[PDB]
Symmetry: D2
Subunit: 500 residues, 4 copies
């Protein structure tokens, strides 16, 4: 862990606007915390509205200059590839900074860095593969083509749980398509985003193509979502903030891409491989202490094996090892902040009040090495039903609910009974049945006999309140493009509708 | 005309909800006017917000039943084709009804009916051509596929200028993809939309798949944009209402598709075919009395031919024949309502007060055959510049402004100097220069040596404040689809992250 | 009830001629050919037997039409409306066309109805595809250039079809050719021209420019080499057997002409112990015996898991004994006759091949003796057992109402055996374990694999073979693509002298 | 020093993971066409070697080590090959110049292209695994999965050896195929070198194989073996036709690129000195030995005389010499046999009445005496009926025909058996576009001559070939479609009695 602290000795503490590392316009700063020990680890600039607007205007100026937007797609791909290579080269430092900033295990952080390399690499390869189309015009003597152009100036806002990963999903396609961008990471987790800006700067982009704003969402966020020079706002986070952003984006009829979490079902039939299902239910509920957009917080298990499954899950939950993300034996780290731990704690009272049982966990751990950190015990909530708040709302902590179902129709009905629609799983050795269910779930991603996979090759996003648009895949790239129909009349003749 | 009045004797006067023609829940009605003579030609139900809610719930019930959403794409295509055939079969009566309701010339209405038949035909043919893709998974022993499903329940709101045409652009892809829909036409122009619902009923769709709500947006529009069971709201009209709709859609993180008009440039270089340019300047400015999303209201003409151009334009403008749309000699009909004529009128005062010249036109005709209708003279405004409201704001009437430009670079700068980005034209015999300009205009559609063309094969929509999303083409169909990534782990193994 | 006689009355109004450059014409030498009904071997019609000079004239008319641009430069949207119009003509004459196909080929009327419904949908699919993809805009790596790929009709196409599903195979070739803007010259099998003549009559009513569509009638040995080897042909599309297909490809090579070939198969039907047993017996029958096994996709090679082989063989044999043979026009008929004297001789010869190599004819293997079948080209549905992969009866395409049954021990063995042929067209896997079926499907070298089904093909998806089963695809977007050619147009928008060479 | 590079270069075939000699111990001498010096000696492979390599490629394919590797990972390896080409660009350029005679600057350009070809296909590898289909049958799921085509044989020619190899190798590897490649027997150096570089990157045993030797000995095995799924060949029409006839024996897919008679259409309103500049480039780069060489100039009648004299005056100034010397503009032709063919065509042209306006012979100068040089040539007063106009000479020779109308230019340009590429020069871009639309060519340039790149497909109409190389279409030659149809609620049909 002190080796990670050493990394901070060379890390920038500033915003990056129009090709320069700059302080806040009023010199304000913010102290960054390590959730493992609640110690202040770094101090960064806290930007102003003026800074955010300046970055947006620099992005517009750069976009209009054409240096990046009119560069060949092949060359843009090379630059995006160079970024992927930097990430891999600095994987260790990046993974350690991510663990320090966010608390999750170092092995999870390394996995994030592998994913990030692959995201940049995927978009590097896609950059030059589709420039638009030739249309067969229904009008004689005309030519019709659709040209795909970069959407323009894009603002990008990320959350605190997977900072660099979420940033990469936005940055890679933006750069690949020729856009100029302004990014703002979560004010409590800026370290790896600062670092990636330092790396991108070495790759070499024209002034203003990339810009980094650091600051509170209530201060600079509205500028980023409501400015008339922005062509697209892309946000990953919670529903309350996402709705706010969308309403603000409306003022200029600005494109929005949103991913807003979920209430992700994990559907376990009685003909599932039982021990696989237990394993994956643990993984679904407790990776990163449940702070994952796709966390499997809502377990739905067939009635015939429900009690056995609950007991098996509880027995394993008792063995989950909490601690420092830098310690190799740690299986689950702390939650992100005092506010977030307070949210999770409040839900325990809620669950009990509405009739559910806390079968295991449901409080902070007592153990000595955990008392100064933001820890919360992995928790199983039983005797639940779909009417309850603890089932319907995104807790975003190390908490899972267990509900029973009798039939395949009942599972589908329950799984779809939420305001969300991000991801979910179906476990059954009967692949035919699993497919039937998968076809009926209103979710952007359905895993059959798995839990958690996402990758650059495939689009990710939500039905219903889980979002608008997609990230990753060809659809992810398309968020950063705009279509133009250029129609040429090759034998123009007067219409003579109006009197001569 | 009186035979079109005879047509009304058989037209429905009601809403269509859940397979039934039905009155308003409050029994309220609205009188429909003919703008040519301001006479009441028809009376229809004025629905309530509970009617809109009921239609939405019926559309959701139908969608979940699967009767349409799970029908084969091939069969959905055949039913869309059957609607197309009905449009052609009833072309004469439909064109007459459109002229009666909107005031446009019969020729214009026939052209509209021919386009509508082709829109339905296009989407009928697209219905079974793309169900998603197979993905090359980066995870060994996994199968990854992206399945494209209908987006779900969609609400569709249309304007009064091209009622049935705009309806076709939304209805055709919605039905082709398997969505259930709730449509609400402009309260002052419901006639052809009622008629097409009659024709769709004849083709036959499951109960709840198609629903027609009649009434003012100030009453039922908030339900249509803000209800939780809606998956996509698609709107065509003005910016004010579009913004309000988007803010309301945000409450449920609902997809939006918007087309909100434009300030469309018509750029004429000194090396244009002169007489072609004059002809098309007239066509761009005055078809449907300038009430076109893509009307060419902002003429930019190269300085060396400016005086020549304005005199030729103005001399042609004086010869424009106003009158009854049913009269074959009419070149321009009336504007749509007293409210809209009043807005156009008020802009003449703005133009004069800010320093522009009304070169010709600028008033209501008062002659016998026009005095009783909502006519407004075709108008040319000169000696204006980009700082003026008359240049920046969409008047949406039979009015054009004329600005000069010195160079190709200045033409592009002026053309892009508006909040809009829908469509525009470049006129020049130097095709190379026309293409350079077309690549730099921030517009969804650019015509080279033409003005007005749109067709089902190519997407249509705006950059900037002209909208979000596209209609027509494969991209328009994609508004009505949602992607689902189904990932199957074909050799699942325990991860064993958490201790045994 | 009077259906056969009413079908025969149709022939009184059917053209007997070729259709070349907008006109119905006799053969240049006035030769003719008698067409028979395989049910009774009677002559039912006489048609012109064209010459190589007629074939050449039609190719030159297709080339002239192509170059005129009336169809090739017509808008895609309008081409699509015309292809739809053909689709609607097919539906308008469904009954007559189906009856004609039964009269000419012998298969049951119910089978012919299904063909006509399929044909309607093939034309409708391609009508709808016609205006959906004109090419692509390319991201040029050269500054100050514009790059696009335009898709154009491939040009003049010759199309040669076989005798088993004459109108269906014709539709697979004609539909995309017309949708894309090609000119075509079609030659149906000499022994089965009736529905193809009728469809030409219907296409003429729809209306196409002179020379866009041409029909040649004649023996492949007389006019075929002209159709595969003429310098003015851009693509030769053929469906039939391997020997003719290879000959055609070698002749097409003389002008480096594109070929699309579908040459039959040795299609495996893989039945696991955990299959739905009665479903597998039902589909083994369907696989083996629809159209008397004269189907490119026939399931002639049954591979059954050893643990249920005896039970399966017994169940299949008992059902085979019940199959009702007879006239295709009779409602109770389940299987009609085979197509010709020659083809029946081939099938019979393979019975002797099988026995000589040690296989058993478990049921069937002969002409039936029942009085109402004696005058027709009937052959009993047949099951051959005690087979193995080394045998010619297992390796070679018999194309008759004959199936072989081999056992396999494991999933690995089933795959190994199924892939141990020179062919690669289609096959099926029957198992309730869908994961297992999917693993097997991924390992089979076949253009189409069905999981718990047998026979489905449709316009929406490409059909064709791996290995000796073919080259290229028919149906789907890939089928359309056979009839298109890509052109890269690259415009230098800032041209400058290279100044490489001295001045 | 290119000669010193040879001290470390392999002299053997690469079969099933090993560098091996042939059972034929008579090696082949490789020549530098600039001085006709023997510069290297290599194994001459046998039929038996070719068969062994095809069997190894089949074994490797069935093993799944490459064919079932993830597309993402295959892309990474193809990228690694791209990086090797860039790392070694200088050495590879010198080897290509040494082996083929072309100028060092042209060789550098090939190497930059080659890097980009591999990089393009590396990026494409994981971008399309097939389609989901909307089945017309209720309760069925339909998907089209794209698999590697299988075992592919690849045969390349002597003019652009490594470039032509890259066009085939890159998509084969990206898609998961196993390959057996055989370069032209007279130009194997850069192909040997790239196999050494691929071995460094590392591929499963048998995935890549290099056969060296005469097509007349091993070619029939490569085109006619039953275990081959696709034969991809670039060269001349008569070998191509032979290959296609042999591939028919197993109904094997073919992709052919067979050259052309490429027109260069110059209108009166073209930029005149641009058109002269580009006519020289079209005709004489690599001494005309280019699949897409602009050997057939069609010039509008108002400027024809002026154009001909301008072109002839420039042709007289073209600098012949050693490709390694910076002043050289045009190197030698490839071989004795090829120079002989060019010479024979001059006799054909004269006997049929055409005029040899300039050139048409070997040069007289002393430093050119030892090499395979041939003078850049312009033939005038000819017409479309002549063999010299219709047939691919593939040497530093152009013909000039006049025309009046754009319709005539189109008709003459299309009046050949070929259809590979061509150009239209005119400042009237609308006119150039109308012409481009009617030309039966795989690539048409407006106001340029020669460009090709990985992003766009390349190939011929008519006798110029079958299929495409480069672009997404090029990748598609190396894939095969499989429709997997699952019936999700299977019911008995009950057609047959029970
Ligand atoms: N398209 C091009 O870029 C290109 C390149 C070289 C030659 N050509 C044309 O072809 C003419 C003849 O040239 P060439 O004879 O030197 O080349 P060719 O057409 O025979 O092509 C050479 C390649 O084909 C191989 N080959 C020869 N016989 C073979 C066989 N039976 N089976 C398989 N492969 C075989 C050679 O070993 C070599 O790899 C030239 O004059 C020129 O017109 C075109
Ligand atoms: Na932190
Ligand atoms: Na017959
Ligand atoms: Na050499």
């Amino acid at each position: 862990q002190s080796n990670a602290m050493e990394l901070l000795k060379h890390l920038s503490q500033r915003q990056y606007i129009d090709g320069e590392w700059v302080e806040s316009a009023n010199k304000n700063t913010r102290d960054i915390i390590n959730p493992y020990n609640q110690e202040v680890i770094f101090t960064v600039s806290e930007g102003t509205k003026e800074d955010a607007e300046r970055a947006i205007l620099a992005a517009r100026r750069a976009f209009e200059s054409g240096e990046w937007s009119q560069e060949t797609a092949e060359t843009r791909g090379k630059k995006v590839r160079a970024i992927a290579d930097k990430i891999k080269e600095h994987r260790e430092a990046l993974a350690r900074l991510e663990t320090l900033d966010t608390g999750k295990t170092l092995e999870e952080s390394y996995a994030d860095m592998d994913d990030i390399h692959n995201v940049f690499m995927y978009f590097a390869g896609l950059a030059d593969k589709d420039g638009g189309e030739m249309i067969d015009s229904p009008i004689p003597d005309t030519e019709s083509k659709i040209v795909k152009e970069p959407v323009g100036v894009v603002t990008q806002i990320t959350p605190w749980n997977y900072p660099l990963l979420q940033a990469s999903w936005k940055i890679a396609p933006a750069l690949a398509t020729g856009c100029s961008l302004v990014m703002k990471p979560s004010e409590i987790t800026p370290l790896t985003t600062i670092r990636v800006f330092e790396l991108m700067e070495e790759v070499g982009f024209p002034k203003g193509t990339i810009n980094l704003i650091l600051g509170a969402g209530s201060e600079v966020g509205d500028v980023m979502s409501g400015h008339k020079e922005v062509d697209l706002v892309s946000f990953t986070g919670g529903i309350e903030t996402g709705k706010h952003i969308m309403k603000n984006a409306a003022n200029n009829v600005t494109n929005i891409a949103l991913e807003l979490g979920g209430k992700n079902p994990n559907i376990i039939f009685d003909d599932a491989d039982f021990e696989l299902a237990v394993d994956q239910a643990l993984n679904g509920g407790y990776f990163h202490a449940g702070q994952v957009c796709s966390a499997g917080s809502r377990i739905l298990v067939q009635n015939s094996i429900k009690d056995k499954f609950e007991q098996a899950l509880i027995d394993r939950v008792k063995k989950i090892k909490l601690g420092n993300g830098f310690d190799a034996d740690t299986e689950m780290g702390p939650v992100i902040s005092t506010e977030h731990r307070n949210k999770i704690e409040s839900y325990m009272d809620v669950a009990k009040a509405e009739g559910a049982t806390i079968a295991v966990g449901g409080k902070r751990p007592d153990r000595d090495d955990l008392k100064d950190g933001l820890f919360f015990e992995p928790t199983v909530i039983t005797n639940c039903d779909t009417s309850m708040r603890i089932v319907q709302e995104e807790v975003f902590g190390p908490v899972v609910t267990v509900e029973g179902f009798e039939t395949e129709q009942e599972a589908i009905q329950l799984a779809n009974d939420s305001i969300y629609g991000l991801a979910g799983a179906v476990f059954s050795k009967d692949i035919g049945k699993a497919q039937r269910v998968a076809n009926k779930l209103k979710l952007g991603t359905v895993w059959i006999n798995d839990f958690h996979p996402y990758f650059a090759q495939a689009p990710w996003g939500g039905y219903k309140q889980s979002g608008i648009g997609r990230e990753l895949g060809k659809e992810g790239l398309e968020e950063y493009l705009v279509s133009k129909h250029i129609l040429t009349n090759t034998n123009p003749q007067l219409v003579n509708w109006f009197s001569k």
